[PDB]
Every structure is written in C-alpha cells, then in structure tokens.
C-alpha cells in the first residue's frame, strides 16, 4: 500500500482521489510520469513531495529509479532520473542511461524541472532542451509540464513575485521552443503549462494544512491536477 497518501492533509487526499477518478473514467488505471532536469533543480525532492514519503535520494552535490504507488485501483509510477548536466555541458551518458531505462515503457507526462529562483537562461539550457528532443522526439513537449521549484522565493529589489516568475517561466518556455525547433504552429497547440513546487519544510501551509504557494494554493493538488490533465490531453503518449 501507498503509505505517503495517508500522510497528506485531508484536503490534498480528497483532491487527489477526485483527480485519479477523472483518469479512471477514461479507462486509465495507471500513468507514468518521467522527471527530467538539469542537476540540482529539485527533481528528487518534487518526487518525494508527490509520493508523500522519502523515496529517492536528495543532495546539493547513474542511475534512474522508479517509484510506483497504488490507491483505489489507480497506479502512479514516477521515474526519477540522474541530472542531465556534467557542467558545463550536457551529460550524454546520463541522458541515454535514461533512455535505456525507458525502452518498452509508455511515458504519459514529462515534468521538466527547473528552479524559479534563477535570473537567467543560458546556452546550456538550450543544449539540454535539444539533447531531450534528439533522444525522445519533438512529441515529448506535447506531453510536458514545466515545474518550477523554490516557489516560495522572494525576489529582491523590488520586482514582484509575479513579474519575476512570469519572466522566468517566459524565458524557459522560449528556450524549450527554440531548442525543440518546434514551429509556432505545434507550440501554441502544445500549450505547456507552468506549475510551481516548494519542497522546503519552511514552506507556508494554508489554513487546510496543505503546502501552499504565495497566492494561497495547495501546490501538490495543482501539480497532480496538471499531470492528470496532460495524462488525459488526448495527444498520444511516448513509447521507445
Ligand atoms: N527551498 C528549496 N530547496 C529545494 C527545493 N527542491 C529542492 N531543494 C533543495 O535542493 C537540493 C538539491 O535537491 P534534489 O532534490 O537532490 O535535486 P535533484 O535534481 O534530485 N539533484 P540531482 O539530479 O543531481 O540528483 C537539496 O538540498 C534540496 O533540499 C525547493 O523547492 N525549495
Ligand atoms: Mg536527484
């Protein structure tokens, strides 16, 4: 059984049950979420948050792991990956160790993880988005969510949270677009959503006990809702 689900706030559990329900009615009774990102960005910490338990390794400084948990006839399987940067360049080994582990699997969602609290995208970020396109295909971005960790960050000086985070995520979506060399046509129709994650224990709980963003909202319920939505978005899943 899924022990982490029993830890969640009454209100998170309730919402998750509602969301797996919408999938179950379409005959989906399992889904596989791949997690990809540059090293250091909180991929493993987002997976522990989602799973509700300490399942993958978390560190400042080989080889992909999968974590399946089941609840009420539904199975979430989430693949944590080694980071894709051996700085200051793309780590092509980690990136085909990942493909090795994915052969014969169906990936329903990609959580592309980066940090909110960063002031710029660079050429390495575009190199990473091209190394992902060269490995899984253009098609993977029709199945992607941009997850931005460190969501509780307060910018200095004093552009607002909402200026900072709209520019940050605008810059990252443009880097995905350019590195992907997707055409304007497939890109709007891909409409890749941006969900926010705060994995810190210092993280504001709202008044229903759920991990909340600055705007008030339970972020794990939003993350599972946007995942459920991409799992259901009627664009086709990725095989290999
Ligand atoms: N404030 C804050 N710290 C975070 C967040 N997510 C991760 N961290 C911190 O960032 C460090 C690296 O996190 P980790 O989960 O290992 O990221 P990763 O992408 O798995 N790294 P790698 O791929 O190299 O394994 C840890 O000290 C962890 O607590 C977040 O949302 N907020
Ligand atoms: Mg990790």
């Amino acid at each position: 059984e899924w022990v982490g689900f029993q830890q969640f706030p009454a209100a998170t559990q309730e919402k998750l049950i509602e969301f797996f329900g919408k999938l179950k009615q379409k005959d989906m009774n399992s889904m596989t979420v791949l997690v990809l990102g540059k090293g250091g960005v909180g991929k493993s910490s987002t997976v522990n948050s989602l799973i509700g338990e300490q399942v993958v390794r978390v560190s400042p400084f080989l080889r992909p792991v999968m974590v399946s948990r089941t609840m009420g006839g539904f199975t979430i399987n989430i693949i944590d990956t080694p980071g894709l940067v051996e700085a200051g360049y793309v780590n092509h080994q980690a990136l085909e160790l990942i493909k090795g582990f994915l052969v014969n699997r169906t990936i329903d969602v990609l959580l592309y993880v980066d940090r909110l609290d960063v002031y710029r995208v660079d050429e390495l970020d575009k190199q990473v988005v091209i190394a992902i396109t060269q490995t899984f295909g253009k098609e993977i971005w029709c199945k992607t969510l941009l997850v931005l960790t460190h969501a509780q960050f307060s910018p200095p000086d004093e552009l607002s949270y909402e200026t900072f985070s709209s520019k940050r995520s605008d810059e990252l979506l443009k880097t995905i677009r350019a590195g992907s060399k997707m055409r304007k046509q497939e890109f709007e129709d891909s409409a890749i959503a941006v969900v926010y994650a705060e994995n810190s224990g210092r993280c504001s709980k709202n008044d229903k006990d759920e991990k909340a963003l600055p705007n008030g909202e339970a972020w794990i319920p939003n993350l599972v809702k946007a995942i459920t939505d991409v799992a259901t978005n009627q664009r086709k899943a990725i095989h290999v």
Side-chain angles (χ1 to χ4, degrees):
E1 85 179 46
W2 186 3
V3 203
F5 191 90
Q6 294 145 44
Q7 299 336 331
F8 289 137
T12 291
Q13 294 195 11
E14 175 185 305
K15 250 93 114 275
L16 281 225
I17 277 159
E18 200 267 299
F19 302 138
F20 301 159
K22 142 149 154 275
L23 280 195
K24 266 168 36 156
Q25 265 118 105
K26 321 299 154 224
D27 102 353
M28 293 208 38
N29 268 67
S30 107
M31 76 182 157
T32 308
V33 191
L34 182 57
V35 177
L36 291 184
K38 299 185 309 196
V41 293
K43 304 177 280 297
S44 301
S45 299
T46 303
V47 186
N48 303 336
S49 276
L50 277 181
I51 290 307
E53 342 165 352
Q54 297 299 303
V55 304
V56 206
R57 233 192 99 266
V58 176
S59 166
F61 293 7
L62 294 185
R63 82 67 120 278
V65 170
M66 183 179 262
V67 170
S68 307
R69 301 275 176 288
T70 266
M71 195 275 328
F74 188 98
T75 308
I76 198 174
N77 344 97
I78 312 193
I79 306 163
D80 200 347
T81 60
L84 300 181
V85 159
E86 180 100 297
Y89 310 80
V90 175
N91 176 6
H92 290 292
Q93 284 147 1
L95 180 45
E96 76 202 31
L97 197 58
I98 290 156
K99 193 160 41 158
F101 199 81
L102 290 180
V103 60
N104 292 318
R105 324 221 187 217
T106 296
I107 294 155
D108 292 302
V109 192
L110 174 68
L111 299 183
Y112 190 76
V113 180
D114 212 306
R115 298 171 65 144
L116 165 74
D117 68 340
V118 164
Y119 273 72
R120 71 182 199 107
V121 294
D122 60 26
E123 184 68 21
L124 173 59
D125 284 292
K126 197 188 228 226
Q127 292 327 319
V128 171
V129 166
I130 291 145
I132 295 163
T133 316
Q134 291 168 359
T135 290
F136 302 88
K138 215 180 287 339
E139 284 76 42
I140 196 159
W141 304 115
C142 304
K143 283 304 210 178
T144 290
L145 274 177
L146 180 58
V147 175
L148 295 194
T149 61
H150 296 244
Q152 166 150 321
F153 142 94
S154 221
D157 294 352
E158 26 174 355
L159 70 198
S160 39
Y161 177 78
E162 183 69 27
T163 300
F164 181 93
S165 63
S166 71
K167 183 200 224 251
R168 173 57 171 154
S169 71
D170 178 59
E171 277 173 25
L172 283 168
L173 301 171
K174 276 167 176 136
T175 294
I176 288 182
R177 209 261 243 199
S180 126
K181 329 201 189 172
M182 255 185 162
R183 222 68 208 134
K184 86 255 78 213
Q185 140 248 133
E186 344 169 28
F187 200 74
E188 336 112 55
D189 316 320
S190 218
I192 297 180
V194 185
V195 289
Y196 293 89
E198 179 61 79
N199 303 304
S200 181
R202 315 294 218 146
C203 178
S204 312
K205 316 195 99 69
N206 70 6
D207 283 76
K208 304 156 130 181
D209 209 30
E210 301 158 305
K211 293 300 207 86
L213 311 163
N215 67 327
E217 273 165 11
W219 79 257
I220 324 200
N222 294 11
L223 181 44
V224 169
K225 176 168 202 175
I227 280 143
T228 278
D229 259 40
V230 184
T232 279
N233 77 350
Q234 263 125 66
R235 292 284 192 174
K236 53 129 138 279
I238 320 308
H239 199 75
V240 286

